[PDB]
Inverse folding.
RNA sequence: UUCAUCUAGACAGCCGGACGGUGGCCAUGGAAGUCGGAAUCCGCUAAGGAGUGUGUAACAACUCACCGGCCGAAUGAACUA
RNA sequence: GCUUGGGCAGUCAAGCGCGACAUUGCUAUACCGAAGCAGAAUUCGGUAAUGUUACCGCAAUAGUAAUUGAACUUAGUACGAGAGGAACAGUUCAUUCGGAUAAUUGGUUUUUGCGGCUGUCUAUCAGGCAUUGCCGCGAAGCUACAUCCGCUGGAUUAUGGCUGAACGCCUCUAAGUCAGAAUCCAUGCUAGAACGCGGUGAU
């Protein structure tokens, strides 16, 4: 537990091989997941209120 | 030389082991680490016997013998005695103590030349071929260890007793702790003239003291 | 944060909400170490890093919020008795919502304090990182400006002028302490790899079964014969007994005066 | 039950059987002091896996910290075979077994 | 399901895109680092290069 | 209790009927799958456990076992079953030319008063060259993708007054049902030893009706993973002369079993207690599949067997020891 | 339904340009558009926010908005049923 | 067609002097996704008569179960400045519950059993009477402080992916597709439709 160990390890070795592609795919899928949640799901009312506030 | 080993994640090697210059006795079990503890330094130089006394893993605490012989308490079964006899050559003498008692390793500590105990004296001398003679300890065996090169005793041992035993034993004696300060010296390590086994908790000063007393270097 | 905690607490449902808020506040307060009471050395070290005034302000704000929530809970047709619950819940939510600043400040320090290079006070002590890595950090043997300055509560020098730092600056910055060295060369006297540690140790301390033959290794020795454990009496070639205890059945049974 | 160590305790006070560890108190400064204890004798015979019906003279046990550190330096009287093997610490201070 | 050939890298070639792609996906998805930090731990096998045999 | 064993109603049939049979193997040769026997007595068994890394590894261990009377089973016919949407159906059955007296009695309730008109025309029908029976055999060969063999036990051999054989079906896990029927044709009116099915250390399951407690009891129950400690055989030497004892003596407790006769014929020793009391009819089945575990693979090392008298109490192993313990007796001299 | 682009080349996808005072002023242990505070200019060119993001203790490297080239007809933003 | 989680005063202003999101002063287990998750530990979210007679058989249908923890081994290894410390898999045990049994032990009770004996009698020979004789020992039965065992294949919720339009990008989804839950169905187990069925011995 030093001042910065995870960051040091990442700099020395790097992130995961598919981290960028996986993150981009997750971001793309979030668009469809938002619609699925809106059409699905108390929880549904809260999600609708949050979306309206956004 | 001295080695650091374990048994079932337990550092009480002496409880489940009894080393001798010609053989070694260990408790039954599939733990390869315990066998490696004695096989690493010398390979298969001397036989290793996986057995038990009265069907217990405290064989180390229940056994008290030397390279020239072995002794077992009355509780030992006939089958176990036969297995021990088959597992050792005719050179090693094996006999059963018929006296009312069970803990032999916690009462008797001896080496290839001398033996210390809390008649049976003649039997002990004959089986081990050693002279039979600690600081008022209730259980000398559980808090003592001995070897031809040297011996180790509990830290609370009196200096006068250590000096007297060393003069009688003709070799130096040192009192120290084992397994990171544990006072049960006879339960945390087993040593012979050329191999010492100690638990993981054994700290560097304890290992150095054990090496120095037996003067391996 | 404040918003997430409020939702988490309220999603489980009146005194239970207050009890949960009190428990969370106590865990936050007790879990966090008091900056002004840890230890003099560590207290000062934390002071140089974090805003001690802001830390105390956040702790006081959390305590006051907990006290206000407890006070509100203690103080507290169908609609008439129903509106009271909504009013109390809204009061609690409004009180909790005022913790965004102290909680935001505590978020930064909560993670930082979890992986500090903290060591016990009793522990013995120009590109010094290279030497630090080489030596070992635990080596058991046998705001930035103020943080660095607090080392007063060893020094390193370079014979050359590596890193672009002037020798005069190094000499001036010096003003027991051991100096390690990797008109210009004469001013160095104004001060007055394990070898250095060895020298400093002074002050640091002052601070398988066989048989007779393997011909019959396959024998099992049943150990029982007609219900008697004969193994205990399996003596080798008992010639005297074989006659003494076997001739009786003919020599003495002939008389047979048992009746 | 009687105490199975040389600590001098008159008696021990709290189903638990031989080899089981439960909280115990020294009924007779130690009054109302709770400490784990291990039963070494129960004066009753059960169906042993070895087939031998063991027996004892009286109920007995040892008082020790949660890790099993024996308070005394020795054990008075016999110790159950199962208990002695189960606890290496008890075996070290055990003098006789059954 | 596709062929295996060869650096510390595997090469998969097959006439059917679906078969080889699914095999690579299954190979990547068996090395799940359960109950472990995703960033700190990088051990596993991941898809790196795609292209035609020719 | 257990909802799976409800409703708790009295069993209609005294003899338990097997509900399932081990999956057929198309490559293995024709072989039997189940055996019939009668529970008889109970005793203690000791051995040494070779299980690796066990608390009793390479050391003695004791427990209780039960003995089931398993006289040789003699086949009486073969039954064929076809696959239909409504379930397995029996299309044709062929019986042996000759049948045992017990088999004939089984088909009677007033045997003493009846004319004993057992298989007469069917038996007389066998006087033909064989075309009629061979025609049915060929029909079974074409159809009946799954086959079963009907057998019965020798009640007369057992020490019971029932004198009425029990009929049951035995499934074959062989392949090429044509080969199955061909094998059956060559074993009509033939007795099959127990060893042909089971062996030492084998894992089987026994089904029988539990004891009636005067509604409590009298329900069929199944116990799986029942290790066969020993497979007794009357043709061999005294079953008590184990490899670790090699001394001739009968396994039967001295003075006879409690409320049961002596056992000399083929028998099986089963680990644990089989459901039901003595004098029952217990069907032995080979677990319906292959159980992979150290429990099934581990062998048995019977160092000692308890065969002393048990009518209330007993201490001697053989009658010759009764006087030896008490010394010379008047009746002795 | 109301507006914007539209054969002076509609939306989209790739390639290229994406600058000079300059690393604006203060803040500097090092922060140069992107750890921070306050204005946001001229020169321009078909196109540069003293900078919308990723990133390094600072540069480094990519970038969208802004245009051009390869592209070819309708496209886009907001509302009503 | 009940129902489920702040008042006061001011700025708001898509729309219709009222009016939206913000906003200012008081008053259990298991499996997945995220966290500065270094390991462990932890937190947040999601899943949950019938022809008579006798035998051998099928199964429409109803019920269903296992369960909690501990030890070697992976290990004092990956991890980490040290403190501390994984998991998968291969093994060994114990606790709860359930189907059964009495082989040892044991509470047990009409052996209403065995040697002696009490008040006493035709006195040891024989125990008569003592609603049930007594002492010590002790069968059968109830029955546990007694013992055996307690299963494996698919389809799936959430979840992670492959190919790939809507929208010439893109996408786990729209057409298709792989893995996957203490979830479903299957294997097994218990009963066998007085009114479901097949074969066989007998006139």
């Amino acid at each position: 537990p030093q001042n910065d160990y995870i960051e040091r390890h990442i700099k020395q070795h790097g992130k995961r091989l598919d981290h960028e592609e996986r993150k981009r795919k997750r971001e793309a899928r979030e668009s469809h997941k938002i619609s699925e949640r809106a059409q699905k799901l108390w929880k549904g009312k809260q999600f609708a209120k949050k979306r309206y506030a956004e | 030389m001295a080695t650091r080993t374990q048994f079932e994640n337990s550092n009480e090697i002496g409880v489940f082991s009894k080393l001798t210059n010609t053989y070694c006795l260990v408790a039954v079990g599939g733990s390869e680490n315990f066998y490696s503890a004695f096989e690493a330094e010398l390979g298969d130089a001397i036989p290793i016997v996986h057995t038990t006394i009265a069907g217990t893993r405290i064989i180390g605490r229940m056994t008290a013998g030397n390279r020239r012989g072995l002794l077992v308490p009355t509780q030992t079964t006939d089958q176990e005695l036969q297995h021990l006899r088959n597992s050792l050559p005719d050179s090693v003498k094996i006999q059963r103590v018929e006296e009312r008692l069970s803990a032999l390793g916690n009462v008797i500590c001896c080496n290839d030349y001398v033996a210390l105990v809390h008649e049976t004296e003649e039997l002990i001398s004959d089986v081990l071929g050693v002279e039979v003679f600690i600081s008022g300890n209730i259980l000398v065996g559980s808090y003592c260890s001995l070897s031809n090169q040297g011996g180790l005793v509990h830290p609370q041992t009196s200096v006068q007793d250590q000096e007297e035993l060393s003069s009688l034993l003709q070799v130096p004696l040192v009192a120290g702790t084992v397994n990171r300060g544990s006072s049960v010296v006879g339960a945390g390590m087993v040593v012979n003239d050329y191999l010492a086994v100690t638990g993981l908790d054994t700290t560097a000063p304890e290992l150095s003291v054990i090496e120095s007393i037996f003067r391996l270097q | 944060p404040a918003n997430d905690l409020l939702d988490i607490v309220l999603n489980r449902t009146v005194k239970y909400t207050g009890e949960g808020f009190v428990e969370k506040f106590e865990d936050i307060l007790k879990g966090f170490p008091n900056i002004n009471d840890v230890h003099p050395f560590h207290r000062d070290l934390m002071d140089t890093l974090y805003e001690k005034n802001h830390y105390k302000i956040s702790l006081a704000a959390i305590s006051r919020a907990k006290s206000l929530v407890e006070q509100v809970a203690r103080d507290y047709s169908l609609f008439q008795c129903k509106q009271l619950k909504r009013a109390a819940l809204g009061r609690m939510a409004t009180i909790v919502k005022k913790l965004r600043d102290p909680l935001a400040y505590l978020e930064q320090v909560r993670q930082h304090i979890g992986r500090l290079p903290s060591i016990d006070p009793n522990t013995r002590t120009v590109g010094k990182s290279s030497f630090l890595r080489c030596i070992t950090g635990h080596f058991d043997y046998k705001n930035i400006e103020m943080q660095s300055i607090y080392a007063i509560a060893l020094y390193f020098m370079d014979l050359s002028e590596q890193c672009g730092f002037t020798i005069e600056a190094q000499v001036k910055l010096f003003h027991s302490v051991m100096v390690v060295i990797n008109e210009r060369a004469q001013l160095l006297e104004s001060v007055k790899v394990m070898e250095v540690r060895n020298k400093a140790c002074e002050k640091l301390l002052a601070s398988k079964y066989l048989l007779e033959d393997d011909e019959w290794k396959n024998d099992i020795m049943p150990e029982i014969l007609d219900g008697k454990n004969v193994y205990d009496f399996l003596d080798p070639e008992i010639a005297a007994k074989l006659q003494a205890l076997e001739e009786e059945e003919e020599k003495l049974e002939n008389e047979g005066f048992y009746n | 039950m009687n105490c199975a160590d040389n600590s001098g305790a008159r008696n021990l006070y709290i189903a638990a059987s031989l080899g089981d560890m439960v909280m115990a108190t020294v009924k007779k400064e130690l009054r109302k002091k709770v400490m784990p204890a291990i039963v070494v004798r129960q004066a009753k015979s059960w169906r042993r896996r070895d087939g031998v019906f063991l027996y004892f003279e009286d109920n007995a046990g040892v008082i020790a910290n949660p890790k099993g550190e024996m308070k005394g330096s020795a054990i008075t009287g016999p110790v159950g075979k199962e208990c002695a093997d189960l606890w290496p610490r008890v075996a070290s201070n055990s003098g006789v077994v059954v | 399901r596709v062929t295996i050939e060869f650096k510390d890298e595997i090469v998969l070639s097959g006439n059917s895109v679906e078969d080889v792609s699914q095999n690579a996906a299954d190979l990547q998805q068996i090395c799940r680092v359960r109950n472990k930090d995703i960033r700190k731990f990088l051990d596993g096998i991941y898809v790196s290069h795609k292209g035609f045999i020719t | 209790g257990h909802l799976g064993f409800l409703p708790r109603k009295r069993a209609a049939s005294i003899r338990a009927r097997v509900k399932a049979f081990p999956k057929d193997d198309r490559s293995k040769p024709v072989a039997l799958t189940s055996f019939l026997g009668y529970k008889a007595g109970m005793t203690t068994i000791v051995r040494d456990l070779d299980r690796p890394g066990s608390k009793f590894h390479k050391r003695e261990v004791v427990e209780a076992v039960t003995v089931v009377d398993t006289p040789p089973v003699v086949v009486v016919g073969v039954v064929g079953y076809v696959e239909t949407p409504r379930g397995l159906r029996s299309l044709t059955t062929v019986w042996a030319e000759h049948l045992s007296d017990e088999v004939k009695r089984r088909f009677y309730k007033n045997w003493y008063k009846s004319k004993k008109k057992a298989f007469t025309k069917y038996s007389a029908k066998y006087a033909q060259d064989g075309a009629g029976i061979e025609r049915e055999l060929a029909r079974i060969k074409k159809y009946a993708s799954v086959v079963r063999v009907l057998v019965h036990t020798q009640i007369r051999k057992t020490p019971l007054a029932q004198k009425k054989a029990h009929l049951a079906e035995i499934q074959l896990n062989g392949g090429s049902i044509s080969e199955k029927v061909d094998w059956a044709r060559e074993h009509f009116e033939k007795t099959v030893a127990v060893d042909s099915v089971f062996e030492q250390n084998e894992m089987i399951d026994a089904i029988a009706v539990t004891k009636g407690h005067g509604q409590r009891g009298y329900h069929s129950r199944t116990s799986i993973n029942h290790k066969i400690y020993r497979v007794g055989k009357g043709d061999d030497e005294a079953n008590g002369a184990t490899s670790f004892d090699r001394t001739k003596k009968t396994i039967t407790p001295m003075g006879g079993f409690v409320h049961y006769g002596e056992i000399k014929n083929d028998f099986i020793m089963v680990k644990g207690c089989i459901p039901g009391n003595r004098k029952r009819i217990v069907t032995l089945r080979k677990s319906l599949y292959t159980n992979t575990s150290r429990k099934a693979l581990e062998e048995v090392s019977l160092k000692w067997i308890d065969t002393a008298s048990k009518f209330g109490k007993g201490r001697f192993q053989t009658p010759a020891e009764k006087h030896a313990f008490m010394g010379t007796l008047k009746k002795d001299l």
Remarks:
- The beta strands of chain E are 3-5, 11-13.
- Residues 1, 17-26, 28-30, 32, 34-41, 43 of chain E lie near RNA strand H (CB under 10 Å from a C1').
- Residues 23 and 37 of chain E are 26 Å apart (CA to CA).
